[PDB]
């Protein structure tokens, strides 16, 4: 990875983290604190799933699956919100994986 690729990869990771933090702040502003608590857990698993792309790529798809299952489980009673978070996290991880594959292929 050259500095340009790392910067693009970091920007994608920050986008997912910042989206999750905004969803937490939104749950706090609307006083849906039990949802804010669930989002903290989902954020922690997102961070682990991102870590694994760099520390152990052979585990990445399993950690992504565990992220989406955690969203499904914790937000089972808020399906609209659950769909928004899965879609942001899926799209974010697709972009990071795309940048990684493109750098390893050069």
């Amino acid at each position: 990875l050259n500095p340009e690729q790392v910067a693009k990869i970091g920007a994608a990771i920050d986008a997912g983290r910042k989206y999750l933090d905004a969803k937490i702040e939104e749950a706090k502003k609307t006083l849906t604190l039990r949802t804010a608590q669930a989002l903290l857990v989902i954020r922690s698993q997102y961070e682990r799933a991102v870590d694994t792309l760099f520390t152990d790529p052979s585990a990445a798809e399993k950690e992504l699956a565990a992220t989406l299952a955690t969203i499904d489980r914790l937000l089972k009673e808020h399906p609209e919100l659950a769909a928004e978070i899965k879609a942001f996290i899926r799209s974010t991880m697709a972009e990071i994986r795309a940048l990684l594959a493109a750098s390893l292929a050069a």
């Binding site: 990875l1 500095p3 669930a38 682990r48 950690e63």
Partner: protein
């Protein structure tokens, strides 16, 4: 506990806060027990039942007295490039860091998810900005009058020696030789 001492869950009297190990739950409108570090709220309190706290499973944690519905995931195990400066336990997250001579290319809130070796400025080049925990060394070519004869992440461009009668002039990678 005797009849004198209120148990959770209870509604706090006007002018009160909840006890130290309690939080005010807005859904029950009651003071309810928090769970300890290493546990989480398996079941939230209601108006008639207290929080149910269960232990975190391996590779998850809670660092504070809490009422999260599941424990948080530890960060992934460190790669061989990194050093694990804090272990994952049921009460604390894993922290991975970079070795001396390396910087953190992708930083986490705590620690690092990707380390990279610091650049070394070759002879003729000196350190312009030193490396930091999260940033690579920046090099510069040595301007006339200065030099660097080493390959190094810390050595800077240093002045040529002064002398009136030059046998061999100095350049960017070697000192002047004086007669």
């Amino acid at each position: 506990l005797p009849a004198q001492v209120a148990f959770t869950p209870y509604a706090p009297e006007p002018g009160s806060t909840c006890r130290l190990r309690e939080y005010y739950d807005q859904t029950a409108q009651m003071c309810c027990s928090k769970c300890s570090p290493g546990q989480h709220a398996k079941v939230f309190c209601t108006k008639t039942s207290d929080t149910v706290c269960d232990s975190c499973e391996d590779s998850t944690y809670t660092q504070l007295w809490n009422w999260v519905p599941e424990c948080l995931s530890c960060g992934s195990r460190c790669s061989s490039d990194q050093v694990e400066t804090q272990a994952c336990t049921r009460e604390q997250n894993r922290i991975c860091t970079c070795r001396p001579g390396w910087y953190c290319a992708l930083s986490k809130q705590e620690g690092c998810r990707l380390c990279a070796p610091l650049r070394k400025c070759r002879p003729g080049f000196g350190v312009a900005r030193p490396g930091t925990e999260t940033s690579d060394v920046v090099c510069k070519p040595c301007a006339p009058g200065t030099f660097s004869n080493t390959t190094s992440s810390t050595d800077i461009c240093r002045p040529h020696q002064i002398c009136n009668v030059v046998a061999i002039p100095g350049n960017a990678s070697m000192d002047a030789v004086c007669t």
